[PDB]
Design a protein around this ligand. Structure first.
Ligand SMILES: *[C@@H]1O[C@H](CO)[C@@H](O[C@@H]2O[C@H](CO)[C@@H](O[C@@H]3O[C@H](CO)[C@@H](O)[C@H](O)[C@@H]3O)[C@H](O)[C@H]2NC(C)=O)[C@H](O)[C@H]1NC(C)=O
Ligand SMILES: *[C@@H]1O[C@H](CO)[C@@H](O[C@@H]2O[C@H](CO)[C@@H](O)[C@H](O)[C@H]2NC(C)=O)[C@H](O)[C@H]1NC(C)=O
Ligand SMILES: N[C@@H](CCC(=O)N[C@@H](CCC(=O)O)C(=O)O)C(=O)O
Ligand SMILES: [Zn+2]
Length: 595
């Protein structure tokens, strides 16, 4: 048969695949929104159904040579439709794997806690009570109690489900001709040197990260005292405003260089201006429309969940953005709260939605990111513009003020503790999981190799001694839910490449120009930038990701150049200020995990 004829076969296969994948997504949404055992059975049934379909599709497609085919687009449609992943397993083992994952995720989403000092109040959750305690409370013993409560409840109790998940994740990789689950994840980036590229970015980031780490540690020790914060050891992580210490934005003002100069937390103005969750999504919609990009369809507003329900049902509150593989059926589920942190999450998620809308005209197997990092980068690029004093003044969230060099340091500092510190964190999560998947990290050393890696690359440690009887990795959503995390590392690098290109197109960035830096660029209302961005996103997965990147940046590789430029003024200030203050840089290894 001619390629124009094979193209008719896959076209019929594509519609078959799309319909069962939609049915499966729909059942997953219902569980995600309403965690009942009944809804779990329907989720795995619909997943089992799709697994059958994908097996049949994969066999049906082995009847075409693909080495005498010429349309490259066509070869690519057949390869992506034939990629089974977990569906490669016999159905019994498939449902056993999904049940192991759901067992972890369910335990995470359903955890509840008694208040510090009040055993009669035991309805506290991660979202919102614990998140906000860590964000705003500066009492170490209270923070330590909740840290211990959280990890004891979401980590060790699911060790066995985790072990089962690892074993069958491996079986699925072998049945797909990969050496391990780690090769499967890395395959999504389509570059055999990609693991090395990530190590190279970590090494370029490290000197800057270590200067910032050193300043934060110095300030936390001045605030909390030397018995709590060692001047030379890793930072007790429960003091960094976040249960995983993945971003330290919540202690930015508490530790800022110039606390009596203008600060850039707009939470109080959001509250004071009567902001609501819906208003917050409306403003993110407006930013995308200002870029000549797709306005949110009405289906989004009808079916999205944008506040935590008040009816006591269990659900996954971890914010997510869903593509139902139809037309304009796109939804966010977010337990939104009215503060600046959540305002950026809004944009992150709406970037996922916008990507969905831009490539929904493609065949189903191209309806994804160019690689998983492109998907995570989209909304964060907007958040880079939204975070500038320029934009916050436009939208009225930041009152006017005299700008000087110290206000600019407070600004650079906030950005560093919000975004720069996350890269070592994101790196360690998949370096750890790759090690479990590959066998380099064995079950009897699961916990101390985790905390050892967190100490090596992030210089943070638990507030109490942990042991191998603890098992702490699943205390992080993406571990319990089996969501690859390198996507966020890649995003945090390339999003600055995307931001630089979009600012250039908006006439907001000139290299070397003090009035047009990456740090003060706002691409709000730049249809010139939106148009080039639209083009990249409309590709979905139809081209190799270097070609998608070139569309917006003229470059074809991930590079830390952009992000090192963004943070160079902060880096120069820290180098001098740590020397002046006598702050130690670097850290001894943590002693907080015992084997
Ligand atoms: C969360 O998920 C549960 C399922 O696990 C939903 O439960 C379902 O609730 C509906 C009503 O809201 C029940 O419908 C009733 O069915 C009976 C007989 O089938 C009929 O006599 C009634 O007229 C009514 O239609 C349904 O039975 C029930 N399903 C199960 C399996 O118990 C629940 O509604 C969900 N909650 C939210 C807020 O979506
Ligand atoms: C906003 O985007 C639309 C496409 O979604 C642009 O429409 C194109 O406009 C050019 C004008 O040079 C035409 O040649 C194309 O045929 C149009 N295509 C479509 C699909 O409409 C529109 O130009 C963009 N607006 C701005 C201000 O950039
Ligand atoms: N860096 C953040 C991002 C996590 C987040 O908020 N949402 C996820 C949901 C993904 C999914 O459920 O498949 C997403 O939007 O990517 C963190 O670690 O908290
Ligand atoms: Zn995301």
């Amino acid at each position: 048969p001619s390629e124009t004829e094979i193209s008719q076969i896959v076209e019929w296969i594509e519609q078959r695949y799309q319909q069962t994948k939609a049915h499966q997504t729909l059942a997953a949404w219902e569980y995600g929104s309403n965690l009942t055992e009944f809804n779990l059975s329907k989720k795995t049934k619909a997943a089992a159904d799709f697994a059958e379909v994908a097996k049949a599709v994969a066999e049906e497609l082995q009847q075409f040579k693909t080495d005498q085919l010429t349309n490259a687009t066509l070869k690519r449609r057949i390869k992506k439709l034939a990629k089974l992943g977990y569906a490669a397993l016999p159905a019994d083992q498939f449902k056993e794997l999904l049940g192991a994952i759901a067992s972890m995720e369910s335990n995470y989403a359903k955890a509840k806690f008694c208040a510090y000092g009040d055993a009669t109040k035991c309805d506290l959750s991660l979202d919102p009570e614990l998140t906000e305690i860590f964000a705003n409370h500066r009492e170490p013993e209270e923070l330590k109690y909740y840290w211990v409560q959280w990890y004891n409840a979401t980590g060790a109790p699911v060790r066995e489900s985790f072990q089962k998940y690892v074993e069958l994740n491996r079986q699925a990789a072998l049945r797909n001709n990969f050496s391990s689950g780690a090769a499967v994840w890395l395959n999504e980036y389509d570059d055999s040197t990609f693991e090395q590229q990530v190590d190279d970015v970590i090494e370029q980031i490290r000197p800057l990260y270590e200067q910032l780490h050193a300043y934060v540690r110095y300030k936390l020790r001045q605030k909390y005292g030397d018995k709590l914060v060692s001047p030379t050891g890793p930072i007790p992580m429960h003091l960094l405003g976040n249960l995983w210490a993945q971003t330290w934005d919540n202690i930015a003002d508490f530790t800022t260089p110039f606390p009596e100069k203008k600060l850039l937390d707009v939470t109080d103005e959001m509250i004071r201006q009567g902001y609501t969750p819906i208003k917050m999504f409306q403003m993110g919609d407006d930013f995308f429309t200002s870029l000549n990009m797709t306005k949110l369809p009405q289906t989004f507003w009808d079916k999205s969940i944008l506040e935590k329900p008040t009816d006591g049902r269990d659900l996954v509150c971890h914010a997510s953005a869903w593509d139902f593989f139809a037309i304009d059926d796109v939804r966010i589920k977010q337990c939104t709260r009215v503060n600046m942190r959540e305002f950026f999450v809004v944009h992150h998620e709406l970037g996922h939605i916008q990507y969905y809308l831009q490539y929904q005209h493609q065949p189903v197997e191209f309806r994804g990111g160019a690689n998983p990092g492109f998907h995570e980068a989209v909304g964060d690029v907007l958040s880079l513009s939204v975070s500038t004093p320029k934009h916050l003044k436009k939208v009225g969230l930041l009152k006017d003020y005299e700008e000087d060099e110290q206000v600019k340091i407070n600004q650079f500092y906030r950005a560093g503790v919000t975004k720069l510190v996350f890269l070592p964190f994101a790196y360690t999560l998949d370096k750890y999981r790759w090690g479990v998947f590959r066998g380099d990290i064995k079950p009897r050393e699961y916990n101390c190799k985790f905390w050892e890696m967190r100490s090596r690359y992030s210089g943070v440690e638990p507030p109490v001694v942990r042991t191998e009887q603890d098992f702490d990795p699943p205390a992080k959503y993406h571990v319990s839910a089996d969501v690859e995390y390198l996507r966020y590392f890649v995003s945090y690098v390339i999003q600055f490449q995307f931001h630089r290109a979009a600012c250039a197109l908006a006439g907001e960035y000139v290299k070397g120009d003090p009035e047009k830096t990456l740090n003060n660029c706002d691409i709000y209302q730049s249809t010139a930038a939106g148009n080039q961005l639209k083009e990249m996103l409309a590709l979905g997965s139809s081209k190799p990701w270097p070609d998608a990147m070139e569309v917006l940046t003229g470059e074809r590789k991930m590079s830390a150049d952009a992000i090192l430029e963004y943070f160079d003024p902060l880096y120069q200030w820290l180098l001098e200020e740590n020397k002046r203050l006598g702050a130690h840089v670097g850290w001894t290894d943590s002693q907080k995990c015992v084997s």
